[PDB]
Design a protein around this nucleic acid. Structure first.
Ligand SMILES: [Zn+2]
Ligand SMILES: [Zn+2]
Ligand SMILES: [Zn+2]
Ligand SMILES: [Zn+2]
Lengths: 78, 84
DNA sequence: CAACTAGGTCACAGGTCAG
DNA sequence: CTGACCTAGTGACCTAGTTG
């Protein structure tokens, strides 16, 4: 499976999407606090892949919130 | 390893930056180099300089060319704990 | 109870600012 | 400019916990 967010290999089904450890952790970290990720530099249309997933935080998150990641979409068990 | 040396200048490496084991100077140098319209003067020797700790700041152009020469890329960064 | 994941833990690019 | 010291994260791993 492929992280449905940065094409990096997926560790499991996370927050309602197949994802890699980095985007899972990066997701919980984004919702599990009231952080104000700095505005976007490159006009809010940032690509997100395994090689540049950490460059824009607003865009990696916004992307997370588009492939349908969410806790109300969490799914425990086989 | 206990002590790995900077692949750009042989200084002690403070980690694995931009894709390779670099000292802390090249690290901040590479970053500063790619992070701007920073174009260094040419190299009075047609870029054949060598890099070591003592002369690593003499010819910039050649150091940067050394960084890129070894692999330093924003696309080669390995964040978080070293795997196994 | 096993298959399977949300969270915590903690091993690991960039801003500073003195030299 | 340069780079030793901070700050703010990043994600490999472990396992407490949840389903079916
Ligand atoms: Zn990912
Ligand atoms: Zn962006
Ligand atoms: Zn170095
Ligand atoms: Zn030179």
């Amino acid at each position: 499976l492929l992280c449905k967010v940065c094409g990096d290999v997926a560790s499991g089904f996370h927050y309602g999407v197949l994802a890699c450890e980095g985007c899972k952790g990066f997701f919980r970290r984004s919702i599990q606090q009231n952080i104000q990720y700095k505005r976007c530099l490159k006009n809010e249309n940032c690509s997100i892949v395994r090689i540049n997933r950490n460059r824009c935080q607003q865009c990696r998150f916004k992307k997370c919130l588009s492939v349908g990641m969410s806790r109300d979409a969490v799914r425990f068990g086989r």
